[PDB]
Every structure is written in C-alpha cells, then in structure tokens.
Amino acid sequence: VRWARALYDFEALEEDELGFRSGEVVEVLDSSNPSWWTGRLHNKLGLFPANYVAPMM
C-alpha cells in the first residue's frame, strides 16, 4: 500500500504520531503493522491507525 485516504480526523497525542483531517491523503511507508501504519503528510512522518484510512487502489 502506497497511498491511503483518511476516513476520520485523527489527533496525534504522542511524539511519533501523524495527525490528519478526514479526506487527507497519506503516503504509506509501512503497512505491515496491523494496528498502526507509518506514513507521511506535510513532509511530516508519523504513525496513525490503520483503521482510520482506506487504501487507494
């Protein structure tokens, strides 16, 4: 998975988390962790809930 679209707003609460708003498109860097994916938005890196995005493919 390379790209995914946010289904809900996600608020980053820890240093390693990537916040986003619903409808934003995240570059997916890791999708092997089933709970938390690693990605990029606004050139910023962080982890976010896999269940908060829908892969685009």
Partner: peptide
C-alpha cells in the same frame, strides 16, 4: 455517527 476507537498505543511497537 462516532468514529472508531484508536488502537492501543502499545501496538505502535513491532509485533502489533
């Protein structure tokens, strides 16, 4: 209406 839960933060580490 309400968004789903965020998974436990401990699962950010490897092995979920």
């Amino acid at each position: 209406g309400q968004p789903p839960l965020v998974p436990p933060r401990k699962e950010k580490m490897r092995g979920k």
